[PDB]
Amino acid sequence: MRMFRITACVPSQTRIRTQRELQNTYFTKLVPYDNWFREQQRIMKMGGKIVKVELATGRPGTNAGLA
Amino acid sequence: MQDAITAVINSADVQGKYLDGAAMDKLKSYFASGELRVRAASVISANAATIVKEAVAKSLLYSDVTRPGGNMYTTRRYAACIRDLDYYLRYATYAMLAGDASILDERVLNGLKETYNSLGVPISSTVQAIQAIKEVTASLVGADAGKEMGVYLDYICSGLS
Amino acid sequence: MQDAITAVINSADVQGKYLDGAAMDKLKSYFASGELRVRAASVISANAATIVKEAVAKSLLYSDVTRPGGNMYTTRRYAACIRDLDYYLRYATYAMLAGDASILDERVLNGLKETYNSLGVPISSTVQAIQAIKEVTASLVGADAGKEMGVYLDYICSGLS
Amino acid sequence: MQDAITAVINSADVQGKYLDGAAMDKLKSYFASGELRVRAASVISANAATIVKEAVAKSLLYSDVTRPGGNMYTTRRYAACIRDLDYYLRYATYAMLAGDASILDERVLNGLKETYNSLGVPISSTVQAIQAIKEVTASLVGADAGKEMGVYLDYICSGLS
Amino acid sequence: MQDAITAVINSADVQGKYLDGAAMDKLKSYFASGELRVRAASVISANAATIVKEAVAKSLLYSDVTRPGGNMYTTRRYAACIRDLDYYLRYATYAMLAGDASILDERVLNGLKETYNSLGVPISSTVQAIQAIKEVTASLVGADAGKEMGVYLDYICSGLS
Amino acid sequence: SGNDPLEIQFGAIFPKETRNPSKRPAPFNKDTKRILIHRGPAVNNQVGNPSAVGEFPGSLGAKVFRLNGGLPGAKVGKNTGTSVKFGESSTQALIRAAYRQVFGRDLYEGQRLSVAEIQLENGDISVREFIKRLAKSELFLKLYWAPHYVCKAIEYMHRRLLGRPTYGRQEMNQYFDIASKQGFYAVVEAMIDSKEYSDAFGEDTVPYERYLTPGGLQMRSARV
Amino acid sequence: SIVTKSIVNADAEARYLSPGELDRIKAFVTGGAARLRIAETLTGSRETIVKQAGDRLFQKRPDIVSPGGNAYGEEMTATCLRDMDYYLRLVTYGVVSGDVTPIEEIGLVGVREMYRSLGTPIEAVAQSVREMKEVASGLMSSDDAAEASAYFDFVIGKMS
Amino acid sequence: SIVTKSIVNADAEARYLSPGELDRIKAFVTGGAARLRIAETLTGSRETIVKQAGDRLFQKRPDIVSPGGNAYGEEMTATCLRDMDYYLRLVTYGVVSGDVTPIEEIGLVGVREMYRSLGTPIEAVAQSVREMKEVASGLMSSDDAAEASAYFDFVIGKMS
Amino acid sequence: SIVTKSIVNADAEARYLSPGELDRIKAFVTGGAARLRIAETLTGSRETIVKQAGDRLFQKRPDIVSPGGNAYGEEMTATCLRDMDYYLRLVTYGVVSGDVTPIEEIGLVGVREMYRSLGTPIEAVAQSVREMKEVASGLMSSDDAAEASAYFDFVIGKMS
Amino acid sequence: SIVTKSIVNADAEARYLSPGELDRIKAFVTGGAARLRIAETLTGSRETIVKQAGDRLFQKRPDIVSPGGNAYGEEMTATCLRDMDYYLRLVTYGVVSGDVTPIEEIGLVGVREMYRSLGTPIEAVAQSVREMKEVASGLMSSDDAAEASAYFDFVIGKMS
Numbered sequence A: 001m002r003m004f005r006i007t008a009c010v011p012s013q014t015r016i017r018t019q020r021e022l023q024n025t026y027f028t029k030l031v032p033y034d035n036w037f038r039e040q041q042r043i044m045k046m047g048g049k050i051v052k053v054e055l056a057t058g059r060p061g062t063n064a065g066l067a
Numbered sequence B, C, D, E: 001m002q003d004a005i006t007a008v009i010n011s012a013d014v015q016g017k018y019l020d021g022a023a024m025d026k027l028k029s030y031f032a033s034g035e036l037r038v039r040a041a042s043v044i045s046a047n048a049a050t051i052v053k054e055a056v057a058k059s060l061l062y063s064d065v066t067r068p069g070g071n072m073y074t075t076r077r078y079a080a081c082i083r084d085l086d087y088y089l090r091y092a093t094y095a096m097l098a099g100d101a102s103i104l105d106e107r108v109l110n111g112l113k114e115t116y117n118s119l120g121v122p123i124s125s126t127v128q129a130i131q132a133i134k135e136v137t138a139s140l141v142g143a144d145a146g147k148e149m150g151v152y153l154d155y156i157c158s159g160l161s
Numbered sequence F: 001s002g003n004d005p006l007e008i009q010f011g012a013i014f015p016k017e018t019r020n021p022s023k024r025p026a027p028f029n030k031d032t033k034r035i036l037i038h039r040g041p042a043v044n045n046q047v048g049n050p051s052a053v054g055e056f057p058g059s060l061g062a063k064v065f066r067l068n069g070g071l072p073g074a075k076v077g078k079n080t081g082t083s084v085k086f087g088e089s090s091t092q093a094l095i096r097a098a099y100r101q102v103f104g105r106d107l108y109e110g111q112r113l114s115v116a117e118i119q120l121e122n123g124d125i126s127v128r129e130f131i132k133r134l135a136k137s138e139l140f141l142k143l144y145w146a147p148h149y150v151c152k153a154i155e156y157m158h159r160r161l162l163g164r165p166t167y168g169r170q171e172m173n174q175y176f177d178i179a180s181k182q183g184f185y186a187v188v189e190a191m192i193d194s195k196e197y198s199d200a201f202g203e204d205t206v207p208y209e210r211y212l213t214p215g216g217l218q219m220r221s222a223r224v
Numbered sequence G, H, I, J: 001s002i003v004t005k006s007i008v009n010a011d012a013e014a015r016y017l018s019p020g021e022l023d024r025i026k027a028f029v030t031g032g033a034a035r036l037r038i039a040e041t042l043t044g045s046r047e048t049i050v051k052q053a054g055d056r057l058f059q060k061r062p063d064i065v066s067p068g069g070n071a072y073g074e075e076m077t078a079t080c081l082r083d084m085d086y087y088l089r090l091v092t093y094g095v096v097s098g099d100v101t102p103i104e105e106i107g108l109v110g111v112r113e114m115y116r117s118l119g120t121p122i123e124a125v126a127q128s129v130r131e132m133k134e135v136a137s138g139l140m141s142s143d144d145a146a147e148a149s150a151y152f153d154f155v156i157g158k159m160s
Ligand SMILES: *[C@H](C)[C@H]1/C(=C/c2[nH]c(/C=C3N=C(/C=C4\NC(=O)C(CC)=C4C)C(C)=C\3CCC(=O)O)c(CCC(=O)O)c2C)NC(=O)[C@@H]1C
Pocket: A033, A034, A036, A037, A040, A041, A060, A061, A062, B060, B065, B070, B071, B072, B076, B077, B078, B080, B081, B082, B083, B084, B085, B087, B088, B107, B108, B112, B115, B119, B121, B122, B125, B126, B129
């Protein structure tokens, strides 16, 4: 199925974390198509910044045969 | 997110000064229009779906966008665009209540342009759709509060374009 | 992913017209060739473990690739290369059953060149391994089916080239 | 990440030979410096918060960064900076104990330059902060051990700048 | 969980007393047996699959349990019993190292009877398999340490029966 | 009482209504929160301290697995070779623990999702996505969802993915509504994409047992 | 398509196709000429199906054509005929594919959110496909109608 | 602000603001004029509050200003007067917003680690805010002082 | 205990103990006589350490003992000496275990919430253990003191 | 190496190296010459250890070298002794490092998937290293043999 390769930077606001957090701060991850709307909202509500969005798998304007 | 109160606090916090006379009047102006911002959101919340209902019919429907070949032909794409415009109208109302457009830069415009470009979503059509929302939002609410909403809806348009 | 039927449907859906005779000819072509597509797939799936084993032996084994200094020396790296060619055979079967090579682009060839360049995986050694798979499969299924299988195995070679 | 022992193992594993006399002396050289590396690590560990204390006062404190408008003004952003310099000190200790700057690449400078540009953390100020760490450490552990620490702290600086 | 050290500490803590001569002697007895426990655990660790192999062979294999109608018939249920005895031996090793059977009650025997009854697992057949482990472990490890392991394996048996 | 599973390492074991009748009905209303014992510190309970939800149990509860260390082949520092890359056993132990959280026990040879494992190892997907994929697996459907009562299967899934029994009706009815309309896969999706999951476990954190039922802790710590 | 549905199910478990899965594709590909015959009949008399079933909907539920309804006027009636023409097109794509995925991806997923924003009763659209099934079954042979109605009934089931 | 909290709670549930929540906003809006009056009195006498409470801290805790202490010298006392000016400024931001969030965000998160790096005792800064509360409650009306004390006690509560 | 830590780590990974973990216990088992030597030294002169560190605390911090303080009175000072006697007992359990678990489990977790409820200054209790460290260090050998200091600083570090 | 493993363990808890962990490296560094001596003896007699244990394997398991087996043939017997040459090389890296990671990394991780692909019995490779242990114990001192066995048994346990 079609997926997004997205880069996001989420900083900590609530607590100072003594452990290594660089992997969960600035990351580039692949997300499913149906999950991206929930994922983008999660980054936005936490107070993060989306760097780059690209459609890694699939092609724009797929009517049938996207799964 | 940053509100109008929070923005005045933050602006004075940058210089490191106390809330001066210029900062005090900016707060008082927001507190004066506070009742106006509450009633406007109450009208929006009453008929939130109704704005999205007619805005597609005014601009997008019976056009090449909804026609086979367009990016709003399928039910899935239609339900996506309906959702988008519903979220666009919701976050504009949030910006109207807060009195700041910093929420818009954080909660919508933060990585939507490159999302739309990657999916082949036409930028011209979506701007026209939010423009179709703008005047009908002003019609349902009023002239003073509709102009307030008209700024934030245009702020989404300027960010996407 | 897109197969042969879905590609015909999608090409008919973009124009918005029904299944025309010109588009029907490609359906008849798939329904005739599908007898060869199923038969060969059942043979490949049967000997899946032995096809890889035979191909690795004649191409990769007892060479400088598997020798210390190569990229296929470490047991972790060996098991990874076995895993890769297990995927390469499986996804080529999927493409052969589908009648389209879009699946290979959709799952396999997505971020494969950049990963292989970063890890320092030899391009020439991988191609020769898939070419070894091609010759083993063609000797097992037949001349017509092996050529048909060999198209997708050359497509995955050219994509990694 | 690899240490000085692991680097000797890796180099011998590349050729696929047993540990040669050249690699044998490399191990004994590390075991000769091993007493110095453990001793210095214990001093840094004991005065971990103490080193950072002198480092910030020398470079960062009483500047525009700590002053309103700066990036180290906020109490959260100050506590993050102490924490950052707590990382830079601990990982330099890790690199010193290992005898290789492989940990500083895979963990520290994996995506540090990317996140610092994203947040808007000034590179010039933080490099000077690690340079302030360098002088405090070398004064504490000694000239011999501070030379080793000075290399790795420069390696953090060079990777970031 | 608590080991022999923690059990002495907890008992002294409950009373609210410092570690007296009786408490110190209980620790000294554990440190005397500490060399016996570590060496025993390393033997079990090395021959982990081997103990389970000769446990099933003695008691379970070539019986009505293995044959159709029995519980350990299917490959799914066979690998389940192998895993079970692998878990039983490992947790007996933990209790052997700790010098207390507190881990067995916390992580194994906590509602293990109710689990085995509901599934329809024979208690008598399982006990015999753990009894088979005991004899195999004692023959492998030694007399004193094999007795030590035999106590906690009996503790599993007593909690199951 | 039948909807409560036994608090054990693996295996969804439920009291059967038919086999040995021990059904104990109690009139529970909607807004009825169940008192749950935290595995870690008693102060770190989210009922009284909601800020301390993502606080790790320090030798009181379960061991936390995190992808703190750098994954092998992240940066092009270790060029071509470096056969002894030390950060490799740590991520493999994380995978095994991630398998152990979704499925209580370690799986067999032809059960491990190899595609999902290597994507995590390459750094294509986060742990949150990896846990989701293991719970969206057809094996998890077959082993825990299909053979069990719908709400029993929901309850056990919540005790595996969040490491917490459901507080009451409000949460149980939510996932049961998703189970009716959307299906099993969306229930998995909802439990992972929940805010409480994100607060307790990050993108790199493997889930763990956070809260126990009083009856479950009694089985653990009221023996001889 | 039934080929794609088989592949994605096999890829999810990370395995080759099942003996049953391969047999189903074999049964589909042999009966592909029969599935093409169903399509050719439905594409040929496409305008007669939607017109009759449309009129049969309007006599059953006249509240649609009556004022206050969604499809009021000759323009909106033509839109309703077009909607049914679009759905008949989806069935023809469904029968040739051998799966309901093409019907889902275009005109089933997010349909309840669509007709809500249009203000169209979805149960009336469900009843329109019911009538479309009835006319199509009477048009072509019963052995082919049973296969055609099976895909029609899914469209009804997902709509209602 | 409570406007910030309301939107956060609304967006989390993916819904518009409830009439109960909207009633809270408009009531805060009406009470915002009174909240601005409290801030004006605090910023009007920002010099006299800090200097009096600063001196009262030096009388209660002489070891602070004594040689060997942290705040010894003309430079080090100036930083302590700066710190108390900063924390008073945080209170003025707190009373305007009608919330403890802008205090928490800017100058009340990781403060325990902040002063530990400097070597400043956290108990002494907790006392300084408590002294600032007493002067603010004395100079300014009691009804508004009880409102202001809620923000002061929040600082002390986080400090200790 | 380090034995407990090694088993818990092996339990979580669901594997037999690592040869590195087995050697870690083996080194602890052999070096257990040294740990019991430090424990007996602290146990033997428990009344000497508490009395010395008590007086040294009350001279450095007079405010806790002075009228209005938390530990003012003959009964309140006796509780404070009892508190340190508890903390010194916690140290002896830590040295024996060879791990900072028993000190954390019994008398470190929920100490901040405890002393806030009682009205005890937390930094003064941090000073009390720091005085207990100083007396204990000058009553045993340099190698014995350095090993004991690791547990003492853990009590100080967590409370501070 | 043990120094690297101690770093990884410390970084996992996000803390500095433990005094016990620092002494563990110190004990390794001081006794570095004795542990490196083991590698020298295994390197010097790298031939006669493989030849003898190889011959021991073919007497202990004659089925693998028998026709139909994996190691049957002149070439297949050669690569088996070549494999045993690789496994001994892993041990020499292991006894130098002071950790079981270098043995695990090169030739122990994903070894089950490798030998299954080649059609090699994993239990027979477990017996080959078992015989390599027995020759190593004979050609070395008792203290050196017991040290080497800890690394040999790790290869045994992971194999079977
Ligand atoms: C409607 C005005 C036009 C239109 C919409 C459209 N958008 C998508 C795709 C997505 N929309 C978003 C955008 C957002 N990200 C956010 O965080 C927010 C705010 C909460 C929004 C609105 C996202 C995430 C997607 C990705 C897919 C998804 O649905 O989650 C589509 C689908 C693209 C496709 O071709 O499949 C569409 C149709 N496009 C038009 O043509 C209208 C004029």
